[PDB]
Structure 1
């Protein structure tokens, strides 16, 4: 809903990724959850990258890395410390 209300540069490329974001539904098993969250996450981060108009990589057959957006680097270190403690 925050993606539909937000004005981007172009709307079709944001639109099909928002449509990918609308297809985030889960089953009772968790084997498919851990693979559908990566497509939900790459769609969310490319909305995050196109919403601020930052240059995303566009190599042939290239994937966007799952990265936090617009944070302080000590906050990045603290949140990765927490996620490693989860690991």
Structure 2
């Protein structure tokens, strides 16, 4: 919904990534959820970076990595420690 409401400098790419984003209901299988959430998260991160107008890796095959944006170092340290505990 936020992607729908927001403006952009190049609307077509945002619409394409929203289209790959806006239908990702889980297929009730343990294996499939990880790959589909991986794809959805890639789309979400690229959409966020385009919204900020930060640079994005356009090199072929070298797809955008999963990362936070604009969060403080203390919070990301806490989140990474929590994920390490999850592991």
Same fold (TM over 0.5): yes
Q: How many residues align?
A: 87
Q: Distance in 2 between matches of 1:32 and 1:49?
A: 26
User: What runs of 5+ residues in structure 1 fail to find an aligned partner?
Assistant: none
Q: CA deviation at 1:26?
A: 1.0
Structure 1 consecutive aligned stretches of length 4 or more whose deviation exceeds 6 Å: none
Give TM-score, length-normalised by structure 2: 0.95
Q: CA deviation at 1:54?
A: 0.5
SS in 2 for 1:55: coil
Q: Distance in 2 between matches of 1:60 and 1:21?
A: 21
Q: Distance in 1 between matches of 2:66 and 2:72?
A: 16
Map of 1:2-13 to 2, 5 A cutoff?
2-13=2-13
Q: CA deviation at 1:10?
A: 0.7
- The structure whose RCO (Cα within 8 Å, separation 6+) is larger is 1
Q: CA deviation at 1:23?
A: 2.1
Q: Distance in 2 between matches of 1:6 and 1:26?
A: 26
Structure with higher helix content: 2
Give TM-score, length-normalised by structure 1: 0.95
Instruction: State the match for 1:76 in structure 2.
Output: 76
